[PDB]
Design an enzyme around this catalytic site. Structure first.
Site, short mmCIF file in Angstrom:
data_model
loop_
_atom_site.label_atom_id
_atom_site.label_comp_id
_atom_site.label_asym_id
_atom_site.label_seq_id
_atom_site.Cartn_x
_atom_site.Cartn_y
_atom_site.Cartn_z
N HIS A 17 45.27 45.50 38.35
CA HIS A 17 46.60 45.71 38.91
C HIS A 17 46.95 44.45 39.73
CE1 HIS A 17 44.43 46.16 42.62
NE2 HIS A 17 43.75 47.18 42.13
N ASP A 304 39.71 45.59 39.05
CA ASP A 304 38.74 44.51 38.94
C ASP A 304 37.40 45.05 38.49
OD1 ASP A 304 38.57 44.17 42.62
OD2 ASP A 304 38.04 45.84 41.30
#
Ligand code: HG
Length: 410
Positions: A17, A304
């Site tokens: 994101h 991540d």
């Protein structure tokens, strides 16, 4: 004019994101520094509008890139069922999906599909937390400690330079944890004050103390920087060498907790299966989310941890020039299937597309003329490669089949 020997026929992007406002500073966070943490423009935990614009830029670029590749049309909204966007349930990923769609095809109505139930986690993005499968405690403990050099102590000891650099940015010696120190006998040290313990359960892994605290703080400075704030880390961070040193502590934790195969494989399995099905030629079947596959482009908004789990499972390693965070906001792991016109064979290429930290700092729009950073990856376990260095469809499928942990499948 010489024609390309390879034709792009399918793309799958797994993206972290965009920049999001960090969570409220914990009591610990204010004890390791005398200074006060700068507040953010948007709700904490949510995607910042700047975060959205940065992702939008990547969307813009990818459109230009796929148009030049002949996969997307230069005009109009993509045909029905040509582009598909999926996102984790969090606000930040859902919003990252919308920003990417807005950049790739402005004004068009490209839906962002999520798990119907938003209040519950999506096992696609971590099958461990929803009990889809469990981690083998003893095996995970051994693998992580092994990759740590045997102990977390030796691990941190080898990174004291980066740890002291962190203390310097925090002015830790004049902090509450340091000042109100109960052992004035020894010199203040984050690693000594906060011992790090590896915690392993069936649904999660973690590091306590300085390692986890350091990983989070260095990422926050990066976020500050990328958000375009006045002086990240209270103006104390001044050069690229200091940025690398600081983030190295962040990349290090991810190396241990998210890239370790004993964890990565189980945690990335649902994603590996989605990616393989999307890249493999087949009529528009399904996987879930009310979205049909295969298709031309599939965009997945995750985190991540997902990028690192995937790299660990596929044995994909990378360093990103200009970007100190190996799993940067908006960072994209791009999977492509190219058909070789000659023998009409199928090949897969992997890349990590990202915005240099400066490109984030200066919010520089992207385009073919001024593209984001891009690193072509190599599947270490791939044997059957083509001239361009891609893995055959069959090889990649084999790599995925062996790396996936069936019990973690969706
Ligand atoms: Hg949907």
């Amino acid at each position: 004019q010489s024609e390309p020997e390879l034709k792009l026929e399918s793309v799958v992007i797994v993206s972290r994101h965009g920049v999001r406002a960090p969570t409220k500073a914990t009591q610990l966070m204010q004890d390791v520094t005398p200074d006060a943490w700068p507040t953010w423009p948007v709700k904490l935990g949510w995607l910042t509008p700047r975060g959205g614009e940065l992702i939008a830029y990547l969307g813009h670029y990818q459109r230009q890139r796929l148009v030049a590749d002949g996969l997307l049309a230069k005009k109009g909204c993509p045909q029905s069922g040509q582009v598909a966007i999926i996102a984790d349930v969090d606000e930040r990923t859902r919003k990252t999906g919308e920003a990417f769609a807005a950049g790739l095809a402005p004004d068009c109505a490209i839906t962002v599909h999520t798990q119907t139930d938003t209040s519950s986690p999506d096992p696609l993005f971590n099958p461990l937390k929803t009990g889809v499968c469990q981690l083998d405690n003893a095996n995970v403990t051994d693998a992580i400690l092994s990759r740590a050099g045997g102990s977390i102590a030796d691990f941190t000891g080898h990174r004291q330079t980066a740890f002291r650099e962190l203390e310097r940015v925090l002015n830790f010696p004049q902090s509450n944890l340091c000042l109100k120190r109960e052992k004035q006998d020894e010199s203040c040290s984050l690693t000594q004050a906060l011992p790090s313990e590896l915690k392993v359960s069936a649904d999660n892994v973690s590091l306590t103390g300085a390692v986890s605290l350091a990983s989070m703080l260095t990422e926050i400075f990066l976020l500050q920087q990328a958000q375009g704030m006045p002086e990240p880390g209270w103006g104390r961070i001044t050069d690229s060498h200091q940025w690398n040193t600081l983030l190295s502590l962040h990349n290090a934790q991810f190396y241990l907790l998210q890239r370790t195969p004993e964890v990565a494989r189980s945690r990335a399995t649902p994603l590996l299966d989605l990616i393989k099905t999307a890249l493999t030629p087949h009529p528009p079947q399904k996987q879930a989310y009310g979205v049909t596959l295969p298709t031309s482009v599939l965009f997945i908004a995750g985190h991540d941890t997902n990028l690192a789990n995937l790299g660990g499972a596929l044995e994909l390693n990378w360093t990103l020039p200009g970007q100190p965070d190996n799993t940067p906001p908006g960072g994209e792991l791009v999977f492509e299937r190219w058909r070789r016109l000659s023998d009409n064979s199928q090949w897969i290429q992997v890349s990590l597309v990202f915005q240099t930290l400066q490109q984030m700092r200066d919010k520089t729009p992207l385009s073919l003329n001024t593209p984001p950073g891009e690193v072509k990856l190599t599947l270490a376990g791939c044997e059957e490669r083509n001239a361009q260095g891609m893995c055959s469809l069959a090889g990649f499928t084999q790599i995925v089949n062996e790396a996936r942990i069936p019990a973690c499948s969706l």
